[PDB]
Amino acid sequence: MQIFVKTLTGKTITLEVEPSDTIENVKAKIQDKEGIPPDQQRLIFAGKQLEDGRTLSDYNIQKESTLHLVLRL
Amino acid sequence: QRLLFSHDLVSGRYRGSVHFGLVRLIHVRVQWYPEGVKQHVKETKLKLEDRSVVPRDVVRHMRSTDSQCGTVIDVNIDCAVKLIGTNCIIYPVNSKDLQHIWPFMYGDYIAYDCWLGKVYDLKNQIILKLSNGARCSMNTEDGAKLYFYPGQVLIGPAKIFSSVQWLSGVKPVLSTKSKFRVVVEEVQVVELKVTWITKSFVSPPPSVITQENLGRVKRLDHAQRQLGERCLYVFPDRVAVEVVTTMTSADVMWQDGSVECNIRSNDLFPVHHLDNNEFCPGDFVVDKRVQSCPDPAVYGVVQSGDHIGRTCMVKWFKLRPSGDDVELIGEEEDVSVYDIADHPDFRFRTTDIVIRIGEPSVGQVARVDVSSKVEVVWADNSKTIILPQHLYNIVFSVLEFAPSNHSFKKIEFQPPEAKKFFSTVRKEMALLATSLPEGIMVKTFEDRMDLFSALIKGPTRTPYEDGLYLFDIQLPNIYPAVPPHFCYLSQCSGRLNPNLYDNGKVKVSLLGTRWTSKSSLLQVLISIQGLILVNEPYYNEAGFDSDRGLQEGYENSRCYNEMALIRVVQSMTQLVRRPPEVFEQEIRQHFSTGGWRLVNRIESWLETHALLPDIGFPLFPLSKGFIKSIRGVLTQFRAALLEAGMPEC
Amino acid sequence: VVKRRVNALKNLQVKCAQIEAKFYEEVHDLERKYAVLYQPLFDKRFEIIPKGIPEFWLTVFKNVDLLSDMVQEHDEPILKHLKDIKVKFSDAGQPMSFVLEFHFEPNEYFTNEVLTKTYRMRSEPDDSDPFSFDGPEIMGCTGCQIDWKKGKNVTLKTIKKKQKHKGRGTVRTVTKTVSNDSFFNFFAPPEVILAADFEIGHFLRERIIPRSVLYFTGEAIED
Amino acid sequence: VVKRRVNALKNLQVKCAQIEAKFYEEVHDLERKYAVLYQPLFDKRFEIINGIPEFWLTVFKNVDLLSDMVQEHDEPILKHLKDIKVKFSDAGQPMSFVLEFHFEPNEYFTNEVLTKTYRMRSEPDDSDPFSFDGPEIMGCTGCQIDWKKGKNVTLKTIKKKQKHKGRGTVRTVTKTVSNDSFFNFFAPPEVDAEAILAADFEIGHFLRERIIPRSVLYF
């Protein structure tokens, strides 16, 4: 399913993620696309701090939905 | 009622002489900072001069009988300032005027090109002008022993200036028997080790930013100018001043929506502790009504509430699927606070650091507007409006078989000395079978013998009375050396007890979150019957032990009694509707005997309140919000009991 | 018992102070001897001191706190003609005493070429034999005469004042001469502030005369 | 114009400093000779001390610079100190003074006489009129004390608490840790270390000038 992840440098990552997928896979894909390691980023949907250990569907992610990338240090 | 709180300005006798001081510690400890040391002294011997109202602080009128709460937006400080070395005192000087002594200070947040960060440490150098007329720079580490503010005058043995850098003037010859006299012109920051936290709209820059790159670093701003804080006053000519008095006149947004601007702080007193069900204007919340607000996307913002009524009015918003805007789902007044809960994610409150998300990019939260948007001071550049959407924030039995999706899995338990564990559990079981007369009971699965599971009945005359609670206990590999690993089965989506967390954690001293190898499950059950299920369970979160006899304690405890009643009814509703695969027959039997008594007792409480009050725990000032919430959940509980096949006695 | 032993120790310390006094007398003698080596350098300084270094010693006074406080605005033009300051020492066999010769070029204020404010230091093991204490320390000054031209004096200043008669209160609009704060009071000690003058003279003895360079260029400090 | 002759006069001041260095050299020579003359008095002290209890221990205790180093547990050691003297370097070598501490037979070390030395300066450092307010102190020479078995106090055998890896069980391990004591400056810091060097230099200067030639006044 098509989703968009926005990074703080202005780029947009277009990703194909299964609704039942876990957030760890999303972090891995984001790392692959930009290199930031899963332990070093947070995913934000409409202000929700997405938790790695829970499926995307139960976060009610939909087609063409928007995600935002934050950094933890 | 307590009448002093942290940082408040007080006048009292030290060494037999009246002096100013700041209260630092409470259940009071006062430090007469101008010249003195911390000491304990009671408030009856003291005279307040200026309370320490600071942003984010929730306050109540001292004189007004109305116990309405309110959050403080901004504080205006008119502070007396004494010049150091001299004794001239200028009053009133507004603290917004005074500037920090050093450009940056220990741990004050900063912003680099596009990164936020706490300055973990900062290396700073003083710039000195000698009586010779020479201008030099020295690290503060060497200057510590010079017998630090612009314009100071000090003396130092010549050798101290061995490592300095002579910026200008004729270099003097350093002789061990020469004593230079220095006037400190400016204090400068050399480097700073930034402990970054967030990126603001790759990788961190260098930790210790080079001095040439400090011009782009911007501090944080707010005024918490306390008594005795070195700073620089500017004539309407920087001069080093120490604040000798403060005049805290703060603006307050009250729970009724009124903004009583410029109220003397002495008329206010802060509330150290909120009942978790108060909601001052702007506190984002989410609904907990079963039917209303089915969409998780909706959130709530409280506009005003009546403290005595325990009822607040809210606006429900939801994000627009397109763009970055928001829309108003609808206004709902008379909404019981118990039906709403502090929003999981959005917790914006004043002076809270925040980062803009998809121009200034790092800032602080000033005020959460009653409308959707929020106010952020980006550094000190400007207060600006921005939605939350894109603003990141900083009796006994031994059952057979095994628990089906229950108790503890993924453990692969293996005791280092199984024989000693068996020796322990034998006596533990004997004691349990012998000394459990209060109805509380336990059971053990045949598989993974460590998998204890207990049902506990509430005592009498308490919000948890007739309250059935299930606990699963994993005995550690090294039992009884360490306390057992408890887990409360939590399903109410709430905190029925300040310790019984929804995540399943439990908290009590015996659980180490004291214990001894002599400690047994019997002691833990006794504690759960004595502390966890107590008459006033408000008194069981990380303290509040001081509150005994405090009016704030009584009020918050009554509200917590109400909330605990709501949540216990909710828990019983769920348990009847979807009970586990274990302990079922006894749950049926308990609900048949006294289960319908809960609803009858609650309805009797409601009827008595309507007519006017019975007894058993603080609930007497039943509030509109409590009545609404309890009725709404009690009809649901009756429906669950009916569909469950539990006819009324 | 022990008192006798400590008394013996103290009496030994008395001989110790006597030998130390001999040591310090010999130190003064060696300083006198090294004068023969010093004065070539200070004489080159004299000759080299626009011609020469204008107001060299007045500038040195200004750049020293102990001496700047002693220089007055009126004094500065007068002391500007201070040609040199140099230290001489006593001859062999005499009590330790040294002289701070202010050699002064011809001017319009006062005539005598030099002002020689001799000094002296203690040369005894101790005031009391049972007790013991020593170390070079100024126990006395000598001062010197200061003449003046008509109206050029600054130690005492002439003014016109409406004074009040003593014991009668009558007003007298008349001229008066009143003691005034001036640098040259440095040469007029209290006929037996004394400690201050002694230490300032000692400073000019060990720092400003020997190491005048450090204090003129700004290359040295004193408080 | 003027600045040129000022600079020449500065070069002259450099030679003045050199002459003063020679002055202080002969001052040290006089110190040595007069010390030869003191030897009868110091020897009479030595025999008198045979005795004024803990004489030099009290002397040190009564001086602000030195009471800072003498620790309580040191008292059994330094009390056996029998004498202290100063020896002065002979002509030809850089000026120095050697403080010699004569200790009676003890249960703590076998050194009949312990030594410690300070080297002073006898020259300026460059072409500028550099500071020389007499012979100042640079460097210093530590020495090893012939301690008896386990009688050292400069290092203390602490039973440091540690925890086993993984198991976490607590245990005590005997480890030598630097310990504060009057003898510590006998092992001065090598080439805050500079601050301790300066403090030791000042202490030794006070010993040479004040403590030893005037020990009676400080008793």
Swiss-Prot record, chain A:
The record marks H68 as: Essential for function. The modification (Microbial infection) ADP-ribosylthreonine is found at T66. It is found in: Cytoplasm; Nucleus. It comes from the Eukaryota. Changing H68G: Loss of DTX3L-mediated polyubiquitination of histone H3 and H4. Changing R72G: No effect on ADP-ribosylation. The record marks R54, R72 as: Interacts with activating enzyme. Transmembrane segments: none annotated. Exists either covalently attached to another protein, or free (unanchored). When covalently bound, it is conjugated to target proteins via an isopeptide bond either as a monomer (monoubiquitin), a polymer linked via different Lys residues of the ubiquitin (polyubiquitin chains) or a linear polymer linked via the initiator Met of the ubiquitin (linear polyubiquitin chains). This is Ubiquitin. It comes from Homo sapiens (Human). The gene is UBA52. The chain holds residues 1 to 73 of 128 of the full protein.
Swiss-Prot record, chain B:
Phosphorylated. Phosphorylation affects subcellular location. Ubiquitinated: autoubiquitinates, possibly affecting its subcellular location. It is found in: Cytoplasm; Nucleus. Its EC number is 2.3.2.24. The keyword Cytoplasm applies. Residues 420-573 form the UBC core domain. InterPro entries: UBQ-conjugat_E2_core, UBQ-conjugating_enzyme/RWD. The active site is at K507 (glycyl thioester intermediate). One of its GO terms (molecular function) is ubiquitin protein ligase activity. GO terms for cellular component: cytoplasm; cytosol; nuclear body; nucleoplasm; nucleus. Belongs to the ubiquitin-conjugating enzyme family. This is (E3-independent) E2 ubiquitin-conjugating enzyme. It comes from Homo sapiens. The gene is UBE2O.
UniProtKB/Swiss-Prot annotation, chain C:
The keyword Ribonucleoprotein does not apply. A motif (Nuclear localization signal) lies at residues 159-165. It is found in: Nucleus; Melanosome; Cytoplasm. Keywords: Acetylation, Cytoplasm, Lipoprotein, Methylation, Neurogenesis, Nucleus, Phosphoprotein, Prenylation. Its main location: nucleus. Belongs to the nucleosome assembly protein (NAP) family. This is Nucleosome assembly protein 1-like 1.
